[PDB]
Design a protein around this motif. Structure first.
Motif: not given
Lengths: 58, 58
Positions: A24-45
């Protein structure tokens, strides 16, 4: 007696519960970085763009 | 483990918002060129003309 058998299974129960905790910890850590990067990239887009001022010919 | 499902849907929400943003920008850019050209063409149309000075015959 039942006392001996209880202790053996107890150790196994603790180890199994640790495994499910790790998933549960490992999965949440993996999804954390993807969700953060997607938000920042879209804002620039959305914000970024080019505009044409004037065109001249010779 | 409500945190896992929250992050997955979050990514989808961001992507959908980008789509609707793109439509509005693309449409405004298309309408810009039509509105600019129409104004300049009409200005030329109204102001331009020919005049007859005098007519002679033999």
């Amino acid at each position: 007696e039942t006392g001996i058998g209880t202790l053996i299974i107890f150790i196994a129960m603790v180890l199994v519960a640790a495994v499910a905790a790790t998933v549960l910890i490992n999965t949440a850590g993996s999804l954390q970085q993807r969700a953060t990067s997607t938000g920042s990239q879209t804002t620039n887009q959305v914000s970024t763009g080019l505009i044409v001022q004037s065109i001249y010919g010779m």
